[PDB]
């Protein structure tokens, strides 16, 4: 998971919110450097940075295009980069670093650090849930959207279903990002482009003989009556001239941002929305189970790489927007690398990922259990 980080990922995370009114190109990372006052710079080592309470980190340079050093990366032990990977028995012994070792730790300000595996509800998947007895909504289908490698937009979607079994008007409404209320799926489907029902129902039903679901959709379709075009369809997302743009925007950048936030794919997005309102009614009609949440295949484990990613990102961006600070003074080389390294250190040695701000998860980087090999 660390290999994968340095190899490919590190290149990526320096290319996205890169350039400015100056570009960042290719990437150079070194084997452990240790840099001290009184002496050149030593080919740092496990033993050494351990006994001397240093950081087993190393060099992070990027080809600046108008080649440049910015910070150090606490390299993982026994990785690709670590002097140790290649070595063998006799050498290990000779280095004093143990043979029977297995690797994996980091070595910040001396001690042996380890990162805590992070279980999480596998992002980007459709799910369907019932609500409690007293509740406006009987059912809701949710989807968390999160760009896999950029801005980690965790904007999300509740697709509801008012009125408990029986009560009149099983009206359907869904909730968007940057959006005050809950739009009845009609307006949405129409602002998306696909304007007439019967067609709307083609996105939603894959069998014209499902008189059941068909039926259900009716009161909603009747909800939307009061607007029929892709103009007022976005006008009533106003929360003039302005609002009809506010919306258009919000629908190509904030709506189901995973899939595509680009442009001409209303066809694809609406069809997904379709499949969602479908799934919702699959369960409103006890046809398929409320989605099992403690399903292991449905959860992912944030490891080294990904942690280094979140971190390296929300960190470096704080630098990118420092560049503009030293530049906008240019009424006419100041790339303070201390932040990039003292950050990695900070969060690593402590456990507070979201910088220093206690509003980050204090728990990761439990410091290696050295009691017995088993442990």
């Amino acid at each position: 998971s660390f290999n994968q980080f340095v190899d490919y990922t590190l290149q990526d995370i320096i290319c996205e919110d890169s350039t400015l009114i100056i570009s960042f190109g290719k990437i150079y990372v070194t084997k452990p450097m240790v840099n001290e006052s009184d002496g050149v710079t030593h080919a740092l080592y496990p033993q050494e940075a351990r006994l001397r309470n240093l950081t087993y980190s190393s060099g992070l340079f990027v080809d600046v295009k108008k080649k440049v050093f910015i910070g150090r990366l606490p390299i993982m032990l026994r990785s690709k980069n670590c002097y140790l990977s290649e070595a063998t028995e006799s050498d290990l012994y000779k280095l004093k670093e143990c043979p029977f070792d297995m690797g994996g730790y980091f070595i910040i300000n001396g001690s042996e650090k380890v990162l805590i595996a992070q279980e999480r509800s596998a992002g980007n998947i459709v799910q369907v849930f019932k609500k409690a007895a007293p509740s406006p909504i009987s059912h809701v289908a949710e989807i968390r959207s999160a760009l896999e490698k950029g801005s980690r937009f965790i904007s999300t979607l509740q697709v509801k279903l008012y009125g408990r079994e029986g009560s009149s008007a099983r009206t359907i409404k869904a909730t968007l990002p940057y959006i005050k209320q809950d739009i009845p799926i009609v307006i949405i489907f129409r602002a998306l482009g696909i304007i007439p029902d019967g067609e709307i129902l083609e996105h939603i039903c894959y069998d014209v003989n499902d008189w059941q679901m068909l039926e259900m959709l009716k009161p909603c379709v009747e909800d939307g009556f009061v607007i029929q075009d892709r103009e007022t369809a976005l006008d009533f997302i106003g929360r003039k001239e302005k609002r009809i743009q506010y919306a258009k925007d919000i629908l190509q950048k904030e709506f189901l941002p995973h899939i595509t936030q680009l442009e001409g794919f209303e066809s694809r997005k609406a069809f997904f929305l379709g499949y969602m309102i479908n799934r919702l009614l699959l369960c409103a009609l006890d046809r398929k189970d409320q989605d099992d949440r403690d399903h292991f295949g449905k959860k992912r484990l944030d490891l080294a790489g990904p942690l280094l990613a979140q971190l390296f990102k929300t960190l470096f961006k704080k630098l990118t927007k420092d560049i503009f600070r030293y530049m906008q003074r240019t009424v006419e080389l100041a790339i303070n690398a201390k932040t990039i390294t003292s950050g990695l250190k900070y969060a690593l040695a402590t456990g507070n990922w979201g910088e220093q701000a206690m509003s980050s998860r204090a728990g990761v980087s439990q410091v290696l259990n050295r009691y017995t090999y088993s442990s």
Binding site: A122, N124, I143, V208, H258, F296, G297, R300
Partner: protein, 98 residues
């Protein structure tokens, strides 16, 4: 567990093309009744299109991972009794060997 490992993360591209060059009706131009029991196709949680005769698709991709052409990690299922094909190139899925 001992055998278990974490998924690293593969690229979606050369599998997306590897698929649309096999039967991928782009979600763009779908025909609700024309394509009746259309086994719809997903990836990382995204609807990339639809394919006819699924069994073929499957046996194909299977002895395609079994040679290496597709990362032997990334996984995908056909939910028979739902005519769906979920594809997962994700990073975070625990897996074992069999």
């Amino acid at each position: 567990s001992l055998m278990s490992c974490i998924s690293v993360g593969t690229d979606p591209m050369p599998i997306i093309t590897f698929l649309s060059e096999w039967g991928m009706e782009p979600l763009e131009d779908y025909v609700p009744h024309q394509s009746p029991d259309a086994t719809r196709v997903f990836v990382n949680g995204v609807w990339h299109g639809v394919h006819r005769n699924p069994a073929r698709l499957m046996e194909t991709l299977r002895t395609l991972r079994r040679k290496g052409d597709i990362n032997p990690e990334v996984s995908m299922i056909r939910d028979i009794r739902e005519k769906e094909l979920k594809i997962f190139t994700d990073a975070g899925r625990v897996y074992r060997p069999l």
